[model samples]
Target: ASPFRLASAGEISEVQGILRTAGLLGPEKRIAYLGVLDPARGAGSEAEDRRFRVFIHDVSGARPQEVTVSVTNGTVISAVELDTAATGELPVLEEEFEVVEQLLATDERWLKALAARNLDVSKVRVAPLSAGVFEYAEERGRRILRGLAFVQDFPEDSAWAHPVDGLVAYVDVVSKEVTRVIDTGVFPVPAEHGNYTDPELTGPLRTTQKPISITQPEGPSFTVTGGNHIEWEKWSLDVGFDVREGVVLHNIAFRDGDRLRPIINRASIAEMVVPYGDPSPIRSWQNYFDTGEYLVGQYANSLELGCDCLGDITYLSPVISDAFGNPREIRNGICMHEEDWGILAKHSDLWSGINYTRRNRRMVISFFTTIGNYDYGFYWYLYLDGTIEFEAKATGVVFTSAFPEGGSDNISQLAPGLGAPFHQHIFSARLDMAIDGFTNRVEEEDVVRQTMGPGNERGNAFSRKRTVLTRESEAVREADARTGRTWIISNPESKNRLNEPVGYKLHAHNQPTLLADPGSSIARRAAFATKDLWVTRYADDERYPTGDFVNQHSGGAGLPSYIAQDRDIDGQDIVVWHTFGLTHFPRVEDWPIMPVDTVGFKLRPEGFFDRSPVLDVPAN
Candidate 1:
């Protein structure tokens, strides 16, 4: 019914000229962070008081759609164009860049000795902003409802909606052909409650001892997993709520950690005025630096309500480019903040996919770091009920996480008075790629016999790599013997669904006090003052697909993934550098480009998760 029936001012100026021809306007009335669904009544008078709205009907077709929420900002917002035919083949974008140079030249010299060591390729190169596959199918429908609202805002259990265990897409739409796929999610459970008294069953976690009121909070709220098992389900209550943007009614609540920087890497990079077709420069040198900031971007674990839960992490950098009006590059050593970044925007702020029948002290550790480039990254664990933890690094390459392995009899299932450290640390590291370049008008085994000889017969002459339609990935680790603390993780892999490499690893117990001291290591002084969260990881020759995150590798090396630096120690100038990026996976070209390539993150305060969380609270 909304074929631009937007109720006039000339149909809202022809639906804002078909959403500025499907690029989706930014700078003029921008909006991001979408969660909590359903509700959008009466739409006019500038949405009356604006509950919500996002409608981008048509823009020359073949690929373009829109529909968001806000009756005045209700929910279920909107998302249109279930199909738009051939959104844009640009002559198969150069026959999908010769099948992405024959599948990354099958790994040529490990990706040409890592693009020969890019300083952004001696400077002056453009194109590195891919996110397309239908905006990753609307960001996998908004990450299965933001991980089902972080497992129903962390009260526990699972499935409030969209926990998607699996799902895939792209079949028609002018023959991009992927047809359909599904594993879909749901595990909702919670009915009986005689208080068991001891039959054992209690996990709704809530505890605030003092500072409650993000919008009223008084009894039963204790989910503290300090270092010991706190007896048994010792206590909990970490429910969740916050969607931020200057609320007038609640006055603006949501301040538990209050950090924000969703994403902003500047974006200057521009220097390939065309030509060099089959030369295979890979990422074309990204035009001369200023990638601004974001190997990963998205923050706000809780920034006092009005900053709500700023979904997809909140970031605001000059809004891409209207003419580069909003400049501020990293200064020295551009991209991935010089070397390490962790802002786990609130970590463990409500997550439960079933499994909590009594026993938990305090557990909610959020860690997200990005510095210089990538590596030295870790999240340590040990939980069958004996706690041990780890967070923030200064040389593991930008950052993202996962780890869940235990052995030597799996550390005999640790609980002997809770000391567990038996040999755990399963790794899942990421940074894969499989881009399918573009710009071909035709030819190349007839466009790979019409896209690898399949049903849709790759017509349009190739170049649709489905642009990732929607994606979601999650990871898990458990050692919460009722919050004794050590394991309770999530790192799921999305899109490119699992060629495998989202990494995780533990069992360092002693050897891992190795923090070389990046300024006493709060994850190496936030990777030296957020200079793009330093990082680095290498092994190349032009091969991509660490499974999406825009073909991974922010710290070049023909593109291995992970790079960032800055250090001193002995004399004491210690900055930081660790490398981990894209927390494993999120593909489908990252979805409607919601702040492009979403899944943002940043954290590196240290003590891990609140040893002084707010130190003493009080800062309005």
Candidate 2:
């Protein structure tokens, strides 16, 4: 074996000279940028917009390795860290849901259904299952008993078989008997059943906003060009606690199918605040009506549970286990979904129930994250009747920025004077919300009329083109169970703030004859932020690759961050905008044996409301 030659102090000085020019000196001086080069727009896409530079000081043990990541292409350019160690874990690409796996090969009915829906049963791991019962009211006089509710899943994808793709069984409300089972089949129409729009909605409605804006490359700054601002009186919820791991996944079964009955309440309930103004005519306000005596409690209480288990993670190691500890320590690897059991069991453990209305009277239920772990999804329910129910799912988010290590402020690329703090350690972030009110079908129509012009002529040529979700993958359809669908956001240019309101001139849903930019009419105005911009935020994590905080964890996959639709307090619907990623700035010991907990976001129930509604909520 050849003896190793030791480098003298002279060699170290030479290496330092080469690194300084690249702009990497320390965590404070790293390069990071959001990729704005449009390949299709004829702008350069070869390299990212330089944001920050990082340099390492040996005495401080901060090896400044110049890192540049492209949010546009999800590519890492550079990364170097010293006095650090890296640990590996499998990527959490697919969360396992055993219910869907049962359909793999055995039954002809299951095989035909999976094939028809383009679902590969082989990709799932199956397990035996049991069913449960639930109750809900449809309309004023309709009550339903959902006795045939089955819980199944695909272990690989962690998919639950709530039968979002199947037949609808219509029953007689007065007779209280099953009438007929009508199959809705698969979704996406080409594939399944349900309300997937024909011809499929595509393209970007708010895509063509001339100059693309980038976060400034200096100290903290704000993007106010497109009406973006850092407002005041901010409220956030940070649910951080440990979910007891060893708690057995419990089964919820009804005493009897017949006992699960829905009671319809027609009395007016104490309505929450209503949104009326600007787009909406003043008279059309739900909050204005003061006539009291509303049905506050629920109509039915016969909710049952089933065979929901927090499956084993043999894929994780004991070392990893010790880091997270117990079963529910909820770092990255453990089955965080186990927390959903509280919803089934109907009690408080590590979980709390959230119901809020934003923008519109749309009601939303949020399952927040805990202090011990900032990762996991929440399951919420909607009671339509005993036989039918509505449900929604959502995940939290974190954000990161890209600038080379230690870069100067006030540099421009697509737009001038745009240098932002990119490549550096973590800093505190906050959120602000501005709501106009909630809207219903009639209210939505009025807003369209005032902004776009008279009785529904094509207001804006791009009105229908306005994507409902994001310009990327948009569709104007309500959430329904009898179908499996994927609404992907396609055009990055089309996205705005997310489910938040966009300018009528930018997205005049049914108005095409209207101008692209509403000159002065109230219709031309917008409420909240754009819903399109709020989807899939994960750029800063891409920019700083080497540090324990910046790099992707739990496999090479990115951390969980999503912007999905959730109902607001007004019972009108809105979207929960979330961003979850890494906080790169951490001390040396922050690695190897990682911290027991990670940070997450939360919304408070105070200023917005007088008291806590979840506790004050009248039982049905």
Candidate 3:
């Protein structure tokens, strides 16, 4: 806590020098640089103390090693190598990804494969395949990179329109060579009828410019202080990013007149999984744990002004490490701004014919990441009514598979010869609620039909059945749109004037749970996606849903294993991991570049407030 600061260039160079002096830094037989790590969070006595740490993969020995160097005030405190296998290292850098693309673009075998089908190599698209790329090795210990292939139009920019079916290339990281190529026979590329590649929108695409602009005549309504912190009237939160989770918010609090009330300690998109439905050899192994395997922050797309966001927006840069373990900064990786949110509330007096309406304004913090052909946009919004919403928008080229041109199967015809199978993109958020104090309780409320016997003539009534989840086992639940079921985290010690416990309710609308069978490989590895909601006692090391290491992970290390002990979670500082997702059934409109498909959930203040929180705001 001695005034938190990001790692400066001087500090980074000094650490590198120390590692070199200690015989841990060199081109070979030395340290494999990871990235800088923040010190322990400031608690009561720990708040006054400060330290820094860095990670390294020791590649000098027979088995790779994991090393952690602790520093204090620019001095090396200790450099201890852990006993466990090296797993916490950063994922492949952008430079390495470029290497894969270059190798594929020049490979002779890949050229021959294209030429066999009368396709030009120059008109082909070579993009890195993310799923299970680093899981395999070329030699004894050398890692291998995998990439998928596609064909682009000669004059147009639509590469996704022409898929190079079942073509995958494997490259050696160290050697920078295409070690192997797997071609499942070239299928006829889908027709380039859906052309979004052209920006001009000409030839059945040309249209009048339709622009949606946000103008702040008086300037931004929100305020950003200390670079990372944001304040919009009653809403305040600290924004941050890491290698795993793209955007994270800490110390989120909302104002209650003079008092700033704490809502959550930390909130983030912990993990994401996209499981494909095709059972073909090419697509069966296509399940991806994007955040855990490849990482979102590393591939975060730069936000464009007026396109990605509007209004008087503020941008924040995120610092990450390269493949060689050098510090790299991503510009405008996150954006925050105040936006007009339609209407806040409305009321009308029927007798007097009088009406009142207030326009709603919300503070939005957002970021985007592109995993292969698919791009994901994540948004965190703060509303005037004290409700926080987390939204995920999926839009990009669908990962397609090959099929015969004249195939009659319904699946293959979904996208003609190049079919985009059914897939699910499930994103889970880790929420550490600090409602009033740290201790909290989660309760389930279900609206169920009540059977009427003698009391009433009509038997068409429903009652809310409340269940206090006192045990860890009972806390796991699924989304039930049929019964109006919801989960709420409440503080037992804090209550409103109405004698109801101060709490926040999680409302997930039409989100699908994991469609994978319980015994399936993907189900075991990504067990966190199996349930829509999970409430567990707070643990510092359990930040991720799919455990610490998910690259080629079999199973038994994620949320399921953590909750296997089934400890009592009642009246304890707890964390809630909520999974929300989309079951994508591909359509014709999803061709070329699919329009955005958005899914979200809200964490709304229940009985936490004494009255309507936005009552003090002036009406528009």
TM-score for all predictions?
0.21, 0.18, 0.88
Residue-level lDDT of model 2, residues 411-458, one tens digit each, is 111112111111111111111111222120101111111245566465
**Candidate with better TM-score, 1 vs 3:** 3
> Across residues 537-571, which tens digit of lDDT does each residue of candidate 3 receive?
87766768887666545575778877776877777
Q: In candidate 2, which residue ranges exceed 4 Å CA deviation?
A: 1-99, 102-104, 112-207, 212-218, 221-620
Top model by lDDT, which number? Answer: 3
The lDDT of model 3 is 0.73
**lDDT tens per residue, model 1, 1-620:** 22111122232233334444445643332222221121222232232432223322221233333444333323333455533222211111112222322232233332342234321211211111222222234333111110001112222322111111111122222222223222232222112221212224345444656653322123222221321111112111111111211000100111233432111111111000110111112211111110111222112112222232211221111111111112112111100000112221233324554432222222222223222222222222212122323332322211101111332221121111111111111112221111111100100011122444555654545331101101111111112222222111111221112342111122211212112234321122122121211112112221111111121112222111222121111111111122222222222222111122221122121111324333332222
* C-alpha positional error of residue 56 in candidate 1 after TM-score superposition, expressed in Å: 15
Q: Order the numbered candidates by lDDT, best leading.
A: 3, 2, 1
Q: Pick the candidate with the highest TM-score.
A: 3
Better of 2 and 3 by TM-score: 3
